[PDB]
DNA sequence: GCATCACATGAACTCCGTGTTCAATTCATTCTGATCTG
DNA sequence: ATTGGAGTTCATGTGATGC
DNA sequence: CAGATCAGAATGAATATACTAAA
């Protein structure tokens, strides 16, 4: 409620909607800030969250993004690998990530080789952008100073093979 | 009372180590009555009782169930034999070692038997096979106390073996029966397919009767993993991508392009974005330059295979006429026998005189003259095959002697034999990196410093390029022009034997160290060939075999089927059925599919009518 | 009706050859009941009756000599009792041949016997063994005329064997029981000394386990040769040389190095004074010029010892391997008998025909065709010994049917024969002497005029050097620099296999076929290990054991006892002494030596313990 | 007369001490040149050789010897041959002789081929150096016209050993 | 203690172009570690 | 000094036993 | 302050009683 609810929301940036809150397990007089996120690390943010991203990210009008935010992953691919084969050392690995907020998806390209997300990671893994993020025309750049992995499951199938 | 206890293992060094831990007094040594791996003895106390510890390690592992029935025969045998009609028993194989003395030593009599062989399924197989031979010859099993004692050591580890000495027990059963059942399955399937390939595949072709098809539970999947890459090559599906191009300005005389260190990208817009970040260059930085020294190695003695390969390449013309020239040359006689398979150059050969007979034909000239002068270096050591000495010219000729393609061939051998003795070609491989924007591009080049054998075979020579202007780190070196390019190709790079290894453990069929021997088997069976660059392109026999498999019966390929049978013969641990049904139902479904496979030899016969 | 005559040859091939000439094409050949030697029957005449001839070929030694099996138990009695308390019998060697049973089953009713074994030594044993085997077999000597006839053929040629069956003879028991004596004496000496040594030295020194210590009439000297070589190599005092060198130029870009007539001086200050008297000059004058020519000697026929020597030195092959390869080539029907001693070719041998057959191999097609033109030169008048003809190729063979050791050994066999009937190489040696101060210096050089056998055997070719420029008396060539050189006395290197043959044949340690066996024997017992360059290095165990013999009793190791025993048994061969009594005298003296060796063995143990 | 005989022996080269001459003689009686020569040849040179060399012989200051002189050779070794192969013919023979006078031992190198004196020469043999003697660096060079061995017998201290 | 007999066994005589796996010791090569100076 | 190999059956040495 | 210069681990060819001598 009120102040404590706002503080709990703003602490993690997990802007869960009221409908998602009432549909999920949010027991009154049981927990306020801790167990809600502790169980939300395995909840469908795509359905329980609001579009705190702008309206026209892919348009290119928006330049810079600031503030700590947490999002899910839907389609992460190495932009420098052929369709048939995805894993190789024939070129530096540049990761293209379809990055989901709940209503307006986007895509981010990884600059620095980071050994925290692999090409086999399950979709829906939590990735938290923390800092200044720059989009060039319709794609957002990544860096280790921005992305922090948390992990989770989007309650889906394997969507593989 | 002073009794005697014998211990069995298989490794001499492990035997010495376990003797050392058992007594710390090195025991005493008796010369090996088995002919190898001398045995040891001590006056120890196994369960605190005075017992002669006589310990031995066998030199091998008796194996080869094979047939033990003359019903094996040959072509004039009942086909049902290869399905199920085979009285199966194991033979005391490879008596070239002995194992008769092994049985004699295991005889006589022992109070207790201790087994310490390999701690795996195969080791348990050896253990049980030794057990069923030592029990019939031991003294007696008087009393309810057991006489078999198995340790639980994992590997060479002092504390582990020390505690395993107390960790005694009886070896677990049915693992040996699982593994030997796997062996008889391999026996039956391989024998079946070999018999009917000898029956039908040869087809009285005359030329193909000499060749043999050696089928196995894994040979066909290995050939399939050699050929599917060729299949995807025939698919020939191209690709599309982008390349970033830029220029760092020179002194206005030369040019200095770069290579976009983040080489290659598969996109339409991210490359455009990088261009947006790399279309307002104003200044560059010299972040790092490198200059190493590596030497190209001198060539080897020419084989028949290498000669044929370069002659199909290089001057370029087919193997049949290549072999025709080889013979005419051996005839007017300028070269030794052209069927070499060695690279040894035996010491008897007169290197000095051989190099001496060439004092003409100015193509080779004062160069080879000074090579005659001073000192000549030893050639590379090769392999001895015992066929005949390698190719080498004798009593050199000139332009008007041979002529045409025969002269071209003789020129090849002459140049290669000149190259066989020389100094290595040394060069400096320099590279300088230019830092612009969020990019750290790099350019590279080579500069030869010593020609060496480069002086004799231009077709194998380092290319000539201008030396990059080496400078200190952090210089300005501004930019010129930048560009966005495109380049694409086929599905490239028919991969090599290393990738064969990698995919081979990837699918999961094979054993601990038998991958090379399967590769050698499948190559001597004339299914694939060895090509320069360690390439493993298959041959006509292999490709027609795999195509005939795929067209009608892919089940026998089914690269996961061998792993499936392995896992269902691994699940036979613990409580389960009999081996009889497990083998019988599988083999009978395969043999029904195989009966109508024989009823459908058509596919292979049309493949023969197409390609032979 | 007709009578039957049985004849047996020593070797199967000579057997078929004798059949070829005798029956002039009337062969009735069929393999005998042994799988080793066939039987040839035909019809002819003998002393005026039309009779039938059957002939076979014993495959070697019919019987060998060995003691009673009880004393072969290795522990029944002390080897001393072997001297005069050990009855000895004869047993059929190589029972796999089943020669005794073959000669028992074949021979019934053969009234007359004629014997065609070799007329030298070591054949009388075999002839009398065959005789004593066949006497209880035929149809009894009812006729008063004797039936045992001996054939005395000198050379294996058509006319000689014609005279051979024209006139026959009778064997010589007196000289048969001389080689009998030598064989038995060697047997007892070995079976005593080697047994006692291997029993003692392994008694307490544990390192001598799993090894055999041997002693005898030939093994000990063939070890002692290399032993003395090693002793001389170790015991050496290095010194230094002092040589003066002169350097001159003739016209331009020409360098000549003079040579001092006084090749070396062994003193530093004396060399310094010689240099002092020499340096003060600038001119040199020619005194004596030469235009003398010489010739190089063409090789004889390839003897067995020489063939082994060249195979070891040039081809890098062990003597046993070389003998085995020669045996294989012989049994396949390419070259004629490996183990031969005679050098001179038969007078009636068709030298031209053999050269005619080998004219299509490309390696010699130019040189063999040229040699056929002027006519073959007569072979060198060498030496004869009444044995089989020397080694020669018998029919052409291209490399296809031959492999490795093939074009190796066979290639030398043929090249030796073409060189045998070829001409000689003519070379000119010119020596020009210069005067430097009061001293004398000269230069030497050689040149080729008309190569003879050097055009077929490259390794035995005159070295090529720049010819000295022409000079005339009274000119003063410009004098360059001089330089004194300090050298060192090079110690002798390790003994080579080629030198061992010289030390073997010259002292007559073994026979033609015994030499390869003994060299293999000493190498196998870990006495001496071969190394790079086919040199023999004695082992630590070998060195310590041999030296004790030198300091105890040299009468068992000096390379003269073999000559002594051989020279003292030929007296029996001519019947100059008593066969029974001489053996006792030889046995008696050796009996004393054996007791002394037992008595004088303690000091050897002191020498043994230094190594271990 | 005494000085006439001394001059005759000087012309023959022979230089001896007085004490030497009355020591060699069997008796101080009438003497002739032949008998005194033979009786001194019997005797050793160590006690009878007077000071007749001008010294400085070892050093290079000396350059030549004139007139008839008398010397001896004590030890002979072939400097032109090795020591282990003492009788090797790999080189032309060229000896060095340890030439003594009763006062000093010098080196005489055989410069010309010669056969009247060999390796197995009786040591202590008498030699005459009439006329020209080439002393190059303080060491003497033999010749076939001046260096003449006259033979002689002395107490054989060598016994070849 | 001795003659006997049947059984194991060695040898003489005769009739008639398979997967899997190692596999029991110690070369000369061939791809991994210490040290001043532009 | 330099030769085809496998299965069968028969003679023989010997160990076990009975007299 | 690591090329040019010298040193260790993996790769990979290695055989073992019978007595002497000699066809
Ligand atoms: Mn013979």
Author numbering:
A (entry chain B), D (entry chain D): 1 to 161
B (entry chain A), C (entry chain C): 0 to 611
Which passages does the manuscript contain on this structure?
Type IA topoisomerases (TopoIAs) are present in all living organisms. They resolve DNA/RNA catenanes, knots and supercoils by breaking and rejoining single-stranded DNA/RNA segments and allowing the passage of another nucleic acid segment through the break. Topoisomerase III-β (TOP3B), the only RNA topoisomerase in metazoans, promotes R-loop disassembly and translation of mRNAs. We present a series of cryo-EM structures of human TOP3B with its cofactor TDRD3 during cleavage and rejoining of DNA or RNA, thus elucidating the roles of divalent metal ions and key enzyme residues in each step of the catalytic cycle.
To capture the strand passage event or the passing DNA in the large central cavity of the enzyme, we replaced the gapped 43-mer DNA substrate with a DNA bubble, in which the 11-nt ssDNA is opposite to 13 unmatched nucleotides. Additionally, we identified species with two cTOP3B bound to one DNA bubble and obtained a ~ 4.3 Å cryo-EM density map of this cTOP3B dimer from 63,000 particles. Within this complex, one enzyme binds to the 11-nt strand and forms a cleavage complex. Interactions between domains III of two TOP3B molecules provide additional stability to this open-gate conformation. While the closed cTOP3B exhibits a planar ring conformation, switching to the open conformation induces a major swing of domains II and III with rotation of domain III over 60° coupled with a ~ 40 Å translation that opens the planar ring. The catalytic tyrosine in domain III disengages from the MnC2+ binding site in domain I, creating a 40 Å gap between them, which may represent the open ssDNA gate of TOP3B in the DNA-cleaved state. In our resolved TOP3B dimer complex, the opening of one TOP3B is possibly driven by binding energy from interactions with both the DNA and the second TOP3B.
